Design a protein around this ligand. Structure first.
Ligand SMILES: *[C@@H]1O[C@H](CO)[C@@H](O[C@@H]2O[C@H](CO)[C@@H](O[C@@H]3O[C@H](CO[C@@H]4O[C@H](CO)[C@@H](O)[C@H](O[C@H]5O[C@H](CO)[C@@H](O)[C@H](O)[C@@H]5O)[C@@H]4O)[C@@H](O)[C@H](O)[C@@H]3O)[C@H](O)[C@H]2NC(C)=O)[C@H](O)[C@H]1NC(C)=O
Ligand SMILES: *[C@@H]1O[C@H](CO)[C@@H](O[C@@H]2O[C@H](CO)[C@@H](O[C@@H]3O[C@H](CO[C@@H]4O[C@H](CO)[C@@H](O)[C@H](O[C@H]5O[C@H](CO)[C@@H](O)[C@H](O)[C@@H]5O)[C@@H]4O)[C@@H](O)[C@H](O)[C@@H]3O)[C@H](O)[C@H]2NC(C)=O)[C@H](O)[C@H]1NC(C)=O
Ligand code: COH
Ligand code: COH
Ligand SMILES: *[C@@H]1O[C@H](CO)[C@@H](O[C@@H]2O[C@H](CO)[C@@H](O)[C@H](O)[C@H]2NC(C)=O)[C@H](O)[C@H]1NC(C)=O
Ligand SMILES: *[C@@H]1O[C@H](CO)[C@@H](O[C@@H]2O[C@H](CO)[C@@H](O)[C@H](O)[C@H]2NC(C)=O)[C@H](O)[C@H]1NC(C)=O
Ligand SMILES: *[C@@H]1O[C@H](CO)[C@@H](O[C@H]2O[C@H](CO)[C@@H](O)[C@H](O)[C@H]2NC(C)=O)[C@H](O)[C@H]1NC(C)=O
Ligand SMILES: *[C@@H]1O[C@H](CO)[C@@H](O[C@H]2O[C@H](CO)[C@@H](O)[C@H](O)[C@H]2NC(C)=O)[C@H](O)[C@H]1NC(C)=O
Ligand SMILES: CC/C=C\C/C=C\C/C=C\C/C=C\C/C=C\CCCC(=O)O
Ligand SMILES: CC/C=C\C/C=C\C/C=C\C/C=C\C/C=C\CCCC(=O)O
Ligand SMILES: CCCCCCCCO[C@@H]1O[C@H](CO)[C@@H](O)[C@H](O)[C@H]1O
Ligand SMILES: CCCCCCCCO[C@@H]1O[C@H](CO)[C@@H](O)[C@H](O)[C@H]1O
Ligand SMILES: CCCCCCCCO[C@@H]1O[C@H](CO)[C@@H](O)[C@H](O)[C@H]1O
Ligand SMILES: CCCCCCCCO[C@@H]1O[C@H](CO)[C@@H](O)[C@H](O)[C@H]1O
Ligand SMILES: OC[C@H]1O[C@@H](O)[C@H](O)[C@@H](O)[C@@H]1O
Ligand SMILES: OC[C@H]1O[C@@H](O)[C@H](O)[C@@H](O)[C@@H]1O
Lengths: 553, 553
């Protein structure tokens, strides 16, 4: 007998549940609806649904009122929209967390075994007719094909939004403090416990590792001078595991906190900037609190970075990304009067979604040079050879690549994408469309409607047979981008919730923590309130190059 | 130079902070006050402080309106008070959690290293003049003395509130799923991760252990028939660590989930009742969901116990305890419109406070027998010899002992108390009075005022020299109880916050979880909504003896 939850009867986030041998029941509790499948809008839902516009529309306003916005941006009308923007968006990611690769139902296990990445939607039943549940071919498109066919870059399509590589890496660096999959435990698990902005990619992700990394004096971080400039310490003092290639594990082999941060000048770069910052922070605090120990100086400085980070990510990273005229702003106080749960848990869907590999270029321009992957990948002197100043200047100037539209992933890394489509499958993520509904959108009615064009479209129908079958990852990257955008609609709609739920879900964002004493001194609190990319750099360098999340001119 | 935070200048929960070499600064943020030491009541605080009565008074109302209460108890006026009672009380325990034995300041470490028990107040600076900070003798009363002198029972003073041993144990059993100190890591740490009502004293506190305990079929729990009655399985099938004495580790050596639950028929007893329940639950669910696996049946059943437990503890355990005419009630919906954080973290102060060892009797009456400790402690057949029915009946009939007033701890166990006073000291808990303020009360002005009498009082002044020096644990147990009460004031005032913060902070209590699908079926949800002690027993026994948290007649 077909497991009825294979059709996904329940609507509006209603829990599907097997009853007896062949039946089921939807648990529409607090969904806003009622009925066998939750499709009978309570009086208010109906109102809200009849008065609420298309998110397609909002994106319009948010990206047009050249004037209306400068005025809104100059008055409280700002915080208002901010508070709004937040609440709504965030009210989507269930919290406490719901399911995981091992449980398509609430469990005390799912709740506490921090190991399991968490999911928004259950998985597609292991006994469902089709792979995605009901529609499609008994076999999903050969991922390797599906990749080169639609995701493989042909001509480098740069991001119309002006994004730059200086941003490209940061993303990567940053995003790697919570997305750490366990090869050992396999897909669906994560090393990076802590789920979120804890910088456990600077201070490592385990107590030992941190200590092997801590200079246990003045609360600073170990390090080494080369050319007179500060840089992360090598394993020969920082006895900690890494991933540098079998060559010169001694000198030039730097320890950071994030195992794989040596494999690319970019990650190591940032890894430097931060460390060089932390220590910098310490220098500041110690002045204010001589009677202070080491542990303190350290922890307090840590937070100040969790702060600065969460600010910069929002008021600059997410900004540039969004394309809004509305001036995003970080201020935990805006949720102080809401019903918010200060606690995040990384979702596998979030992970899949973040794979913005197409961001990467063709080559890596630097002044007159133009390092090819081979010269870049695993290179191990580029960083010290050129210097942060210069290197940053060299990224903030090279455009990144459109993350959507399709066909924009380089060939060298094209393999990742294939694995994501392969991994997605191990995980059993429901169809793109099922993941549009869950995130407040309408299911596409056809590949034509999906993609802006018709060429790819037709081919994809030929492959998936039915639009509903379409997968998660592919959907996102193949979706028609917004006009002059970096990526389509579904990306933002699905991303932000996860995104902001995690930026503001950080304990430091809670009333409890968000005090000036938590960052000891008013000096700490101001560093967090006034952080900037331009400052994260130039305050920790000899000279101030050009730094921004977008290209100049 | 004296570390100024040794005086505890900051008031109303204001953070004391060293600035420069010899100064300090109070961070009065959101405390309701302003000023160097936070003692300048903002306009509203002032109002609230000028209109709010003594908690001494409230306890009066809550324990007198014989009629007013039956009427309040019969109308919504009930839920109202309940919602009130909760919110207030709970709004005290900082959450996210603040400090731990290792940090007298917010830290990412303190936040995530679930190992550390957490504290409400910082510790008493390791460089303060006196042991408690400012006042007292450079040496605290020899704990061993202080114990036998004031806490050692002389004549058995039973609980005037009618409490019974059937309650006595439950307390112990129950309280042991979150209070598990690591001999290895030492005081200030805890094995029982999960902090709270997770029954990790049934299903053990680690994944392996659970599996060694799980019968992996129909989601039930391993077990064995003796006399035809169900009982926990012995290690010879349940290959899991225990603490039974070097004698017959084979038969009669039962595995439960809570290592030390063999050392007393009471704990093992309950341990049985629960298991016999869980399995019972399973039998029920499986009927409703044949298409169900094992893991599910298990997890779902687990929650139903976390439910039942949280209900019974409140609507019966806390009830009997309180002495209120108001009819306490468990209903997570009552906080759905509040700003509550579904997340607890056991506090060391909470632990200290819960040491209600004086609950224990002199001997252990059973029908005509009267087992002395020696015959009780570690006994290992009593349980199977007599039978749950009979045994329960035998506890629900023997009175417990006044937990306060002083001098009511038995000699056999009197050692625990001494260690608590010794442990408290390792921990460096601030003075009782400092812990009265923090919990919304006035500091006692004299030992006379503290104790209802004057004998003990005088002696204690002679020892501590100054009332303020008085310790935490001793304070509580030496405090004058309320009239016809089980224990003084400070106990409830300090206990409930921790207490209810933990009962309702359980994820199942969140909107997210609190659905009928979380307990799959409406049948599950009703088991939780209608749990009872009388039912926990009699539904899992041959016959229904006498069961209640108090003595009959
Ligand atoms: C988060 O969640 C993951 C699980 O998804 C946790 O990691 C997994 O943990 C389990 C348990 O440690 C581990 O188990 C695997 O299963 C093998 C099967 O075991 C056998 O089958 C049953 C199970 O009890 C027994 O009847 C068998 O008999 C044994 O009985 C004796 C008892 O003393 C044994 O000593 C004797 O050897 C005998 O075989 C037997 O146990 C197990 O054998 C094998 O070791 C294997 O590891 C998973 O493999 C773990 N790995 C993962 C990622 O799945 C993770 O720990 C959780 N996180 C936290 C902190 O809770
Ligand atoms: C929660 O919090 C507790 C801590 O309160 C965690 O448990 C403790 O964890 C620490 C770290 O594992 C452990 O450390 C102890 O300290 C000893 C001192 O170590 C030496 O001093 C410094 C420290 O790095 C080094 O310069 C020394 O040199 C070493 O360098 C080499 C590097 O490869 C070493 O291999 C070489 O041996 C050399 O000595 C040296 O490390 C440490 O040596 C000793 O092992 C000791 O364990 C605490 O003892 C732990 N125990 C407790 C309860 O305090 C707990 O893990 C946290 N929970 C979680 C999950 O995070
Ligand atoms: C938007 C962030 C981002 C960027 C810019 C990026 C840029 C690059 C890059 C360009 C220099 C190269 C050569 C790689 C190479 C890899 N990446 Co990424 N990756 C990124 C996010 C990820 C994520 C997320 C994963 C999956 C595992 C994890 O870390 O959680 C990943 C995994 C991988 C893997 C392992 C196999 C797999 O899971 O498919 C390789 C190899 N990569 N990556
Ligand atoms: C109100 C609950 C309660 C009860 C009724 C109770 C009843 C009894 C009892 C009666 C039959 C005996 C013989 C003991 C014996 C002991 N108890 Co308790 N204990 C209780 C709560 C605790 C707590 C709490 C601890 C501290 C450690 C922990 O488990 O977290 C404890 C610790 C102990 C210790 C270890 C040394 C120490 O920490 O002082 C012994 C021995 N005991 N206990
Ligand atoms: C790693 O990067 C260094 C530069 O930091 C590479 O050396 C440069 O190579 C180009 C041509 O390959 C020369 O024109 C530059 O002058 C070199 N820079 C200097 C001064 O050394 C090096 O070849 C790279 N290694 C790898 C992996 O290819
Ligand atoms: C453990 O408990 C058993 C009872 O379950 C004890 O045996 C009883 O002992 C009393 C006197 O000591 C007899 O009058 C009862 O008739 C006995 N019960 C039966 C039928 O065995 C036993 O002595 C206890 N063991 C210890 C540790 O003393
Ligand atoms: C609720 O969802 C189910 C599942 O899709 C709907 O479909 C069932 O009933 C339909 C109408 O009678 C039939 O067309 C289908 O054969 C049947 N499918 C299954 C698998 O049950 C059902 O109609 C929905 N009910 C409502 C009120 O929309
Ligand atoms: C704030 O708290 C301090 C600490 O107790 C108070 O005490 C200081 O100032 C008093 C009045 O001038 C003196 O009597 C004390 O010597 C001094 N003590 C210390 C250690 O600083 C201070 O008065 C308080 N201020 C207010 C406004 O109440
Ligand atoms: C925990 C941090 C996680 C993510 C933070 C960084 C980037 C977010 C990733 C995806 C976000 C999706 C779209 C982003 C662009 C605009 C949305 C943000 C503003 C909004 O719409 O509420
Ligand atoms: C996580 C569970 C922790 C504790 C639960 C069980 C017992 C509580 C322990 C101490 C509570 C202190 C006083 C109890 C008596 C009355 C208070 C409860 C009602 C109230 O005043 O809000
Ligand atoms: C619900 C009340 C407002 C009407 C909703 C209209 C939704 C129109 O939708 C949006 O309109 C924009 C221009 O208006 C277009 O640029 C967008 O592409 C389109 O999606
Ligand atoms: C080259 C830069 C100068 C541009 C001047 C014209 C700016 C018009 O700007 C926009 O025009 C819209 C009309 O479609 C109005 O609805 C908007 O409110 C206004 O911001
Ligand atoms: C603040 C507005 C109400 C007045 C507060 C009076 C506080 C009196 O206090 C309480 O009064 C009870 C009887 O009234 C006594 O039984 C209690 O022991 C006593 O503490
Ligand atoms: C032996 C049981 C019968 C008792 C009958 C008298 C009950 C009185 O009861 C109480 O009396 C108070 C007067 O002090 C009133 O203020 C209270 O409202 C009332 O509940
Ligand atoms: O994208 C426009 C809007 O779409 C809605 O569905 C979200 O809930 C809003 O928070 C968002 O601002
Ligand atoms: O004990 C009476 C009252 O005392 C107050 O301090 C608490 O905040 C209340 O929740 C409690 O009901």
């Amino acid at each position: 007998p077909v497991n009825p939850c294979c059709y996904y009867p329940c609507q509006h986030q209603g829990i599907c549940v097997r009853f007896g041998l062949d039946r089921y029941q939807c648990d529409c509790t607090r969904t806003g609806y009622s009925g066998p499948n939750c499709t009978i809008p309570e009086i208010w839902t109906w109102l809200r649904t009849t008065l609420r516009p298309s998110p397609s529309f909002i994106h319009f306003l948010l990206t047009h009122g050249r004037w209306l916005w400068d005025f809104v941006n100059a008055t409280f009308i700002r915080d208002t929209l901010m508070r709004l923007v937040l609440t709504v968006r965030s009210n989507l990611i269930p919290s406490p967390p719901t399911y995981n690769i091992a449980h398509d139902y609430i469990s005390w296990e799912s709740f506490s075994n921090v190991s399991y990445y968490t999911r928004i939607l259950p998985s597609v039943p292991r006994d469902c007719p089709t792979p995605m549940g009901t529609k499609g071919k008994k076999q999903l498109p050969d991922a390797e094909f599906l990749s080169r066919r639609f995701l493989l870059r042909r001509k480098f399509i740069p991001d119309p939004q002006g994004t730059n590589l200086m941003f490209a890496f940061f993303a990567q660096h940053f995003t790697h403090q919570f997305f750490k999959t366990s090869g050992k435990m396999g897909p669906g698990f994560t090393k990076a416990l802590g789920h979120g902005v804890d910088l456990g990619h600077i201070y490592g992700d385990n107590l030992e590792r941190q200590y092997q990394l801590r200079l246990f004096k003045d609360g600073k971080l170990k390090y080494q001078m080369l050319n007179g400039e500060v840089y992360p310490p090598s394993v020969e003092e920082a006895p900690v595991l890494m991933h540098y290639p079998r060559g010169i594990p001694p000198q030039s082999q730097m320890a950071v906190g994030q195992e794989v941060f040596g494999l690319l000048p970019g990650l190591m770069l940032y890894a430097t900037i931060w460390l060089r910052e932390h220590n910098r922070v310490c220098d500041l605090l110690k002045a204010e609190h001589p009677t202070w120990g080491d542990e303190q100086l350290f922890q307090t400085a840590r937070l100040i970075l969790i702060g600065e980070t969460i600010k910069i990510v929002i008021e600059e990273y997410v900004q540039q990304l969004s394309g809004y005229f509305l001036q995003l702003k970080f201020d935990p106080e805006l949720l102080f009067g809401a019903q918010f749960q200060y606690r995040n848990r990384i979702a596998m869907e979030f992970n899949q979604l973040y794979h913005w590999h197409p961001l990467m270029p063709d080559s890596f321009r630097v002044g007159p040079q133009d390092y090819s992957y081979e010269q870049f990948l695993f290179n191990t002197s580029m960083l010290v050879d050129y210097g942060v100043e210069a290197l940053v200047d060299a990224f903030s100037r090279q455009p990144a690549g459109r993350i959507g539209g399709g066909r924009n992933i380089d060939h060298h890394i094209l393999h990742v994408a294939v694995d994501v489509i392969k991994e997605s499958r191990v995980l059993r993520l429901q169809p793109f469309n099922e993941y549009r509904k869950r995130f407040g959108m309408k299911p596409y009615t056809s590949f034509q409607e999906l993609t802006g064009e018709k060429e790819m479209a037709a081919e994809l129908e030929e492959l998936y047979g039915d639009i509903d079958a379409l997968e998660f990852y592919p959907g996102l990257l193949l979706e028609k981008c917004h006009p002059n955008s970096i990526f389509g609609e579904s990306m933002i709609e699905m991303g932000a919730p996860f995104s902001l739920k995690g930026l503001l879900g950080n304990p430091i964002c809670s009333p409890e923590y968000w005090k000036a004493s938590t960052f000891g001194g008013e000096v700490g609190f101001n560093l967090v309130k006034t952080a900037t990319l331009k400052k994260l750099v130039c305050l920790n360098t000899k000279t101030c190059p050009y730094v921004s999340f977008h290209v100049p001119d």
